[PDB]
Description:
The protein has 274 residues and is α+β, with helices and mostly antiparallel strands. The chain has helices at 56-64, 97-104, 109-128, 178-183, 188-205, 213-218, 229-238, 249-253, 264-271; strands spanning 6-15, 18-25, 31-38, 45-47, 53-55, 74-79, 83-89, 94-96, 131-132, 141-144, 149-152, 159-160. Helix 3 (109-128) packs antiparallel against helix 5 (188-205). Bound molecules: 5-bromo-1-benzofuran-2-carboxylic acid. 5-bromo-1-benzofuran-2-carboxylic acid is lined by residues 12, 17, 20, 33, 35, 72, 88, 90, 94, 142, 153-154. The site of 5-bromo-1-benzofuran-2-carboxylic acid (UNJ) has 12 residues, from strand 3.
Amino acid sequence: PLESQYQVGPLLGSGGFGSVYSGIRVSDNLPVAIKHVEKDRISDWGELPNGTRVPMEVVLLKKVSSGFSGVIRLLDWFERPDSFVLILERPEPVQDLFDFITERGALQEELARSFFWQVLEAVRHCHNCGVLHRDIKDENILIDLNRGELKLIDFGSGALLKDTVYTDFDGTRVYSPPEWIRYHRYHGRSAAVWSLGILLYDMVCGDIPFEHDEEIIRGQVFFRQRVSSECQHLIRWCLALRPSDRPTFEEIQNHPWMQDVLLPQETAEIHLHS
Ligand SMILES: O=C(O)c1cc2cc(Br)ccc2o1
């Protein structure tokens, strides 16, 4: 057990998710992130194929763990008297998509296309593993800059995927759908698709489309940057007011705007300077 295994570096960030530090696994010098979550702030608990009582976040991370690099991997976890500590993979060099978009502004469509396509593969992976993320947004996406690979992180608001209605939510309100805002009800997939329309708008315009409940519920989309008609059509489709008018992941990926994606490595070479 215990913390002779890791060397702790700088605080990377803190918020509604807790406090995350940069670290290094002593035994092999592997870069990691060490995330601390307070017990008092965990409202959702689960249990392991084992039967230990742990944060749902740990259950969800283990369900999605794999060599598939589009979703962050949980390497280990520790319990403390008042907290859990999660050891997560850390790409180096790395930048979150929110910071990238702060620096670069609106992304060229070729680049948004490659990023959005990888996010779609990542989210399909979560859903295949029985996990609904419920907080897809640029702050929860890391870019592995040498490889041009995106990783979904932060499963602290997520849930087991089910086919019936959700009536709780604690992810990001500006990425939440109209049906959550009006009725406090949503189904997991069509709510995920709505957050993906907000994300894709964020990438191609450089900020999210809606800031207020009234705008979310109206669902009228205004493009403040020049954006191709095929891209605008995909976005307006993801942002359909009625959940069942939203595309499936397969319909998103077969959309004409999604064709001819760059490989991740080509993406880093052309856009991230490799
Ligand atoms: O909340 C998380 O899952 C999280 C934050 C984070 C930051 C880095 Br860097 C790497 C992995 C990470 O995972």
